[PDB]
Amino acid sequence: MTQKEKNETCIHVTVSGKVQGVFFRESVRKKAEELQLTGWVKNLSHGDVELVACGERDSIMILTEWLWEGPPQAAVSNVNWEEIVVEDYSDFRVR
């Protein structure tokens, strides 16, 4: 494997709770960028926040812990993640 291939993976996450009207999408993108992760995030209508995050595993695991807190005024009730088949992204975007 290349070093990037060896040292990186991807996860898929859903985040439940009070996650609307608190700029959750933007906060995930900003946090991900600070952790040098790529992927995407959206707010499912009437539902959970959903994201894919790819990059180094330490960063991934810092993100998954942070998702229990979220941005100010967020009230997260659950974070459900799994590692997935790797997908290629050049940046982290809101969707």
Ligand SMILES: [Cl-]
């Ligand atoms: Cl974006």
